[PDB]
């Protein structure tokens, strides 16, 4: 629960993949993503590896093509609910790419990116909903603007991204937020 940009309860995997939010800006937007490495598979160390710039391109055919990436998110929430944090919330994680929200581009600058392990068409787990909510509630306490600004990657990069997809139950998530 927020200690110097770090979720107190999260497993910390500090990533070299971050820089500054221009103008010391407080984030105001929560972007929900999904991810699975390799695609459709859960449980590997590969998301940690990708988001820290250490992935083995030879470990899977799919990895060769993404080894060139320099990306990250603030948090990943695994299928069992485990929260792993890579980037302090005050800092700029590299998760949104080319994007626009309410006419403002470069969404990394002012957003917090949280990844749900999963896919567009498979239900996310009960733990995942409870934990995303706990994190979101923590964030809103620090950054009340986030209550008003919660979106999918597919919403700020339409026709580039589809996550977190139809499988993400906004109703369920909202019911758990700001209680």
Q: Consult the annotation and say whether 163 binds a ligand.
A: yes
Instruction: Let me know if 105 is a catalytic residue.
Output: no
Q: How was this structure determined?
A: X-ray
Q: Consult the annotation and say whether 153 binds a ligand.
A: yes
Range of the domain at 11: 1-179
* Rounded CA separation 89/73 (Å): 10
How much helix, strand and coil, in percent to the nearest 5, is found in the chain?
30, 20, 50
Q: Are 2 and 142 in contact (CB under 8 A)?
A: yes
- CB environment 86-115: b (16+ within 10 A), e (fewer): bbbbbbbbbbbeebebeeeeebbbbbbbbb
Domain CATH number, residue 24: 3.40.80.10
Total domains, the chain = 1
* Rounded CA separation 48/13 (Å): 8
Q: Are 21 and 149 in contact (CB under 8 A)?
A: no
The number of C-alpha atoms within 13 Å of 160 and in the hemisphere containing its C-beta is: 11
DSSP state of 120: S
Q: Are 168 and 116 in contact (CB under 8 A)?
A: yes
Cis status of the peptide bond prior to 72, with omega within 30 of 0: no
C-alpha closest to that of 62 among 77, 94, 40: 40
Q: Are 120 and 165 in contact (CB under 8 A)?
A: yes
Q: Tell how far CA 18 is from the center of its chain.
A: 13
Q: Which of 25, 105, 115, 159 is catalytic?
A: 115
């Amino acid at each position: 629960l927020l200690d110097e940009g770090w979720l107190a309860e999260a497993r910390r995997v500090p990533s070299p993949h971050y820089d500054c939010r221009p103008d010391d800006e407080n984030p105001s937007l929560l972007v929900v993503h999904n991810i699975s490495l390799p695609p459709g598979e859960f449980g590997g160390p590969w998301i940690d590896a990708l988001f820290t710039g250490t992935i083995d391109p030879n470990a899977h055919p799919y990895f060769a093509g993404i080894a060139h990436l320099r990306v990250s998110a603030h948090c990943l929430i695994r299928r069992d609910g485990e929260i792993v944090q890579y980037v302090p919330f005050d800092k700029r994680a590299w998760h949104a790419g080319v994007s626009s929200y309410q006419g403002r581009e470069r969404c990394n600058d002012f957003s917090i990116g949280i990844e749900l392990e999963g896919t567009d068409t498979l239900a996310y787990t009960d733990a995942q909903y409870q934990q995303l909510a706990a994190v979101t509630n923590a964030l809103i306490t620090r950054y009340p603007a986030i209550a008003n600004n919660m979106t999918g990657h597919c919403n700020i990069a339409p026709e580039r991204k589809t996550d977190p997809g139809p499988s993400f139950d906004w109703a369920r998530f909202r019911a758990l937020v700001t209680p």
